[PDB]
Subunit: 431 residues, 4 copies
């Protein structure tokens, strides 16, 4: 067992830090003057253009598929550096990565070649989005006997027709509400959308993923695809994740990701399990920013006392708990991503590890930011420090990419409940 | 022992709710539109005028002093209802209350009568501020051997001269940056403001409090009193609590609140012990708003499943924890304000109770808001729900009115370490 | 609103402390040398004898019913003082009190006068036990479609015939395994115990309570009532709560507490809601003992340093935390018992307050003891301090009298789910 | 960065598992009959003999020094498996390992050759003990202006003379109160024990360590070395860490382990740093046994309901939390021991990492046992399940090997305060 970083892992960090410091620090001056979510998002376009130019979008795609991703650990390192400085743009990169993943994970080389092309070219500002979440919620999308996804699709001739609404998926409307360059739309197959999901059929068998592009949207009537709204968010105020309605929206059969059913569900689950693990690096980044700002402050400020405040046990106890939370978090993220990369391991073992990671890292980052604020004191409450921004941004993490209470805990629970569950298979191997 | 509310307590509640619902709900339409902290504060003025007109400033001053305060439990009830709806303006009322406290608590009838008069008139929009906080911090303001307060005062003939900077005291500059109608400025006495506090004298023996009005400022050179900035805050975005510089600022000796020393410090400490307990009510208001919003949501929303999410044990667990936090918090605040009004109890028993209250209620209010969000899920993160506002507002409480880590835990620790510490005196008698 | 204590409340406290300090402090010398649970229990009899003699058992019975209980706050004060010194015998007093509660709460004057008489007499060592808990568990006893209680009762002629097993009910076998002076035995009515509970009938409608005395047992075959074992507990090692098997045990119809059904369930629910509130006083006593020991230590010991350890912020932080938990706990207990006594409030309002109290005070008492131990340090771990006893005793409280996880949180959840739930009705009145 | 275990790492786990299951499981039948701490400890002698015969003592010594230790990760894995089954004897191995450490670490191959010899032999039952802890505490042993250690040494001719008392150090009196085969006695150098430590001297400059063997004790008057008592412990009831008084105790100057002062303190610090990282493996073992018993129960018991209790969200939530705590803990220990082995890192980096690990793993192991108990419910409180023993055992860990509050948190606090503190040095390398 080994924790040493390769020169390429160290270079990835250096590269990521430099990008964050020289480019991402300039974003605030641009987006701060904009007075709604979309305007703020549009104001980050030149930074994502720079991200593309720096090869960061290409680094979201595995090398066998023509990308530049060296490993998930490299990716983890990069995301922590980006998020420790500025989630603006950084969030758009990971959202794109997630949007690309169903394609990256499917086993069709020609679909891959076709749809990944703009993302590996190193040019423009191509956006991807995994359009799963809905206005009515999704924690119970797989519940047998429940309503299921409210976005449904039916086959009509050589075409699929999408009806319903998505809400939350980052990048989904593109820069201009004419659509992301690639959206993966998750639907429940239904021949009559006005009829409830058949309670005698397993919801996972009815799942389909349809690839929707700018061209797809252009080939539809204008009111077949509409942005109804854009949520004003507590934090991550420069991201876009609109309320989209599909009305009789036509998609060619060649844009179906795979045969509807368990294989389509498996592509979604795999992608959200990859993300579950990697989201820990975003949480670490945000919390580390908090911990470091508090650490620096505590080692150079006496707060009208005679000694630096890090010398008070109560202040140091906070910084200690923060440090422990960040250290355990990163270890768990690195464990999770290498587990996911281990071909000798069963899915359920990878999934369990990925759920734990999401749950821990995201809950604990919140505590870390709040403890840092408490240690710094009143000064952390004003926007000449970064804590107000960090507080709002860190609270996204336990809620997003499938919230801990409704989704991640439940997925983990289902695995632990399995008769052949091996708690330590990822550590000591399978018996 | 009894928990039943009297007719006037129930009516105090009815009256605070009605004012919050009919008046305070309209404030956001005005302030949200504004560009910066000061202008948001200014957009709040008509709502403070309505508060005055509803007798809510008069209710901050005891009846013997010509006010209408019925009791601290009434006060707790009012603050909870107010903050459960809208901290804007509500914050201004309680900051005024605090600014009034050292005058209320001194026993100089001529001073009370002179300086409390605008606040009991039921007219205008008079503001008070207790100016204690500084740019360099105040958690160590009484540390023997430390530099102490950096706002100092010196006697020159029949007046006092203030040299230094305050930061954070709410209302301190008034509506227009020409001053609160009354400010109590806490200074360290120093003959020479360049000489470091004498390491051999107890800092508490050097505390003075000087009363400063808009008239006091007007009678000084323009540059004697400078507003240098206005913090942009995470939450409570409509409050003013500027950065103020006093440079050779002249104050009549008759505006000195009491004799410098333990008595002046004792006034500040008592003022802040009373606020310590009452901020619990503010915390409960905010946390209660989160809990009730989450509860209604969980009882009416299935999140695309077959049952309301309250039926999921993990959701219910969060709401149970929120409910428990709120219920224990309110009990402790009422216990505290009740303990503070008990003439039979000695100061350290009251102070300890008050410290306990600020610490518990403010820490636990934050967990309550976050657990409420986690229960609601993704939808709590967007501004068409209250939670984004509540999250930012609730984090103020463990940090402000003397933060828990540096101030309140240290005050409490000092009491507990005394030889004659009686942990259960407030309950089981001395 | 008022927190001042009356002379009789202050006297109740003085009396309980005096008894604890002069009688109960002597119990350790006697049970410490016994070899098993039952012997330690039996070694306790003289102290229970003294408790009776001191009026403490009579004080478990309301004044209208011939007892001397002045109120539930009085009760709370007393229990805190007892458990702050020695849970031995104290636990026997409270278990009896629970045993007496379904009789206390029925509205049959002749039954009360009859069955409560030994307990109001001021003489003997009479024990009572509410026999609810079962080897298979009881968290799901009212689950529709479940197996229900495995102790069943059927009517045969003019008597009832109990079949099944109880586990845990304190005092149930009495001092000598010939039975408690009064045992309230909760059964599920079933005509054929070898057939499963009907999944179409609400389990609450089938609940019966049969009073079983030492005479009832004497009038049965010796093998119809068997003590099969006595659990060795981590703490409260002087209590007896045996494994009891009923095999065709005949009970007179005049021993039926009420018509089987929702009234019988209601009596059990009300008994356990009252205990749920009062058990908080037990938790507070135990954790107060931990806190006071730690506090006296911190104020008198420098641990090889220059100053008393209370001067260290981290130690003080623990004690502060202990203090807050104790203070909030006792307030909540007083709130809850006063709520239970308020004739103007709906039951669900009383139930909810009672559940909250049990959940909070019991969970928080565990943290309090543990934090006290951490503050004292290594010395807390040896049996020449109270802590090792306190640790084992405190861990009982979240688990017993309806565990928090399986029972109390589920009872509270059910009330919160109701359409007419008023969160603050106990504070601000109902609408 | 790699987490894969080698065949030798897998073999060490199998081996340790086989040992715990075939040998350690039998220990309880012997020690449970004994009536005091020392008797129980002596009853474990046959099992320590077996441990020597399995080469487990030899494996506490590095290969360069003639032992069989393969790595610190090997050692972590072994201690986890041992403590998961039975901390009796397992504690004695680990106490001996700590005892040997200052010798293992010193600059003297001749001292190493001489004193380690009986431990690498593979026969008998040799015990080591690092004797640092005292009746008055040690958290402030290095405080300038404080009384310092109360076990003191003066040089008298060509011998050293020990005056003072020790309390807590495991194995110190050996099997028979005639001494551990090897004991490293940590002393404060004081020409006159009657005089207070000089407030002008850095206490660290006055530290000496004297090796004391059974021979050393035999060459002294009966009352120069006396056992005043043996603490009765809450858990780990089969260890010995007695109260020891040295009255004019003579020790040859050749037995002086190194030059008194910063170098001697260095060896003690380094030894306790290593134990700090490795006690997490003990804590994990105990918590893991709690988690696994609770998991198996949750997956096979319905508690009188229609489904296994793991299906209840609240129960699963407890198991999830336990799992997360165990996973993050193990990762941290492996990171800590690997960091300790890294020759390229500054000492303070290794020290901070070891402190982190001790604090986190030990605090979180207690939470993990208590959660497992809450999930199982009332059943967990009786001694026919492991929990009562585990609860008592787990509470040792935050308190022992330098309690978290007094020692480990302050050692970490000192590191973080240093101008050149590098929080991420153990991960991302030093600047
Ligand atoms: C910055 C950002 C980026 C985003 N990017 C994307 C994206 O790229 N793609 C995408 O599809 N979405 C995206 N979203 C949404 C995100 O993935 C959310 O996690 C998702 O909407 C699910 O929300 P939820 O977990 O609260 O589930 P919900 O269904 O909304 O449930 C809400 C709450 O209900 C309760 N609950 C419901 N069911 C249960 C149950 N069975 N058991 C216990 N509790 C239950 C829980 O408390 C849960 O938290 C994004 C959101 C944000 C803020
Ligand atoms: C909305 C609002 C209204 C306000 N109104 C007023 C007002 O009306 N009047 C007024 O005077 N002020 C006011 N303030 C300020 C408020 O009272 C702050 O609590 C006050 O500034 C003290 O801050 P602090 O506790 O963080 O101490 P600081 O001295 O600023 O110290 C900050 C941190 O340093 C650490 N620290 C410093 N010393 C120690 C120590 N000895 N031991 C352990 N840790 C230590 C702690 O972690 C502490 O949290 C207001 C602030 C806000 C946001
Ligand atoms: C099973 C077992 C095995 C053991 N084996 C050994 C062994 O092999 N060798 C050995 O030397 N000892 C051994 N001991 C002792 C063990 O290492 C203890 O941790 C050690 O005695 C120090 O205890 P302590 O941390 O509680 O410090 P103490 O000095 O006893 O301090 C007690 C408490 O005071 C407070 N405190 C004191 N000073 C400060 C401070 N400056 N700042 C903040 N808080 C403070 C803290 O709350 C602390 O927990 C063993 C004990 C047990 C139970
Ligand atoms: C000192 C002492 C005195 C006692 N006195 C009495 C007495 O006087 N009378 C008496 O009847 N008993 C008595 N008992 C038992 C006590 O009342 C227990 O709390 C009771 O047995 C119920 O146990 P439980 O809550 O763990 O439920 P169980 O049915 O044993 O279930 C245990 C666990 O399973 C899980 N679980 C089961 N169902 C659910 C669910 N639906 N939802 C979520 N989780 C679930 C929970 O994690 C729960 O903790 C005593 C015990 C002790 C130690
Ligand atoms: C690298 C994968 C990280 C995905 C983060 C984007 C958030 C999507 N979401 O909230 O579901
Ligand atoms: C009733 C008193 C409430 C306290 C006023 C809040 C601002 C004061 N402060 O933060 O120091
Ligand atoms: C009145 C207080 C009742 C406590 C009885 C003792 C335990 C009962 N129980 O665990 O169910
Ligand atoms: C290498 C393992 C070290 C653990 C030694 C046992 C207790 C030591 N202690 O308490 O300091």
């Amino acid at each position: 067992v080994d924790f040493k970083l390769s020169p390429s892992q160290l270079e990835a960090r250096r590269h990521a830090q430099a990008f964050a410091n020289t480019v991402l620090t300039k974003a605030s001056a641009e987006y701060s003057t904009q007075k709604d979510q979309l305007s703020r998002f549009q104001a980050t376009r030149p930074f994502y253009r720079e991200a593309v130019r720096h090869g960061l979008i290409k680094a979201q795609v595995p090398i066998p598929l023509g990308g530049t991703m060296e490993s998930l650990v490299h990716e983890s390192i990069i995301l922590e550096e980006l998020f420790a400085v500025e989630p603006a743009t950084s969030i758009t990169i990971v959202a794109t990565a997630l949007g690309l993943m169903p394609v990256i994970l499917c086993d069709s080389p020609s679909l891959q070649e076709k749809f990944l092309k703009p993302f590996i070219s190193g040019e423009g500002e191509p956006l991807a989005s995994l359009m799963h979440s809905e206005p009515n919620g999704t924690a119970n999308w797989l519940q047998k006997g429940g309503p299921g996804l409210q976005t449904t699709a039916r086959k009509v001739g050589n075409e699929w027709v999408i009806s319903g609404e998505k809400l939350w998926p980052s990048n989904s409307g593109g820069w201009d509400y004419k659509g992301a360059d690639l959206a993966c739309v998750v639907c429940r197959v239904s021949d009559d959308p006005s009829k409830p999901q058949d309670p005698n059929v397993d919801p996972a068998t009815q799942i389909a993923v349809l690839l929707v592009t700018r061209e797809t949207i252009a080939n539809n009537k204008k009111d077949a695809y509409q942005i109804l709204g854009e949520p004003e968010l507590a934090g991550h105020i420069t991201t876009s994740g609109p309320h989209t309605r599909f009305t009789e929206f036509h998609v060619p059969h060649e844009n179906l990701l795979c045969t509807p059913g368990l294989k389509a569900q498996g592509l979604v689950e795999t992608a959200f399990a990859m993300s579950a693990a990697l989201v820990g690096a975003m949480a670490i980044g945000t919390a580390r920013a908090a911990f470091e700002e508090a650490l620096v402050f505590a080692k150079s400020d006496t707060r009208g006392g005679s000694k630096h405040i890090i010398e008070h046990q109560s202040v140091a106890d906070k910084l200690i708990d923060c440090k422990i939370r960040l250290e355990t978090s990163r270890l768990l993220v690195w464990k999770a991503v290498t587990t996911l990369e281990d071909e000798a391991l069963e899915w359920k073992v990878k999934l369990e590890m990925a759920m734990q990671t999401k749950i821990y890292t995201t809950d604990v980052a919140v505590e870390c930011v709040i403890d840092a604020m408490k240690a710094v004191g009143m000064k952390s409450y004003a926007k000449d420090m970064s804590f107000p921004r960090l507080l709002n941004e860190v609270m996204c993490y336990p809620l997003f990419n499938g919230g801990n209470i409704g989704l991640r805990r439940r997925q983990m629970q289902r695995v632990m409940a399995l008769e052949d569950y091996e708690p330590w298979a990822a550590t000591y191997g399978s018996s």
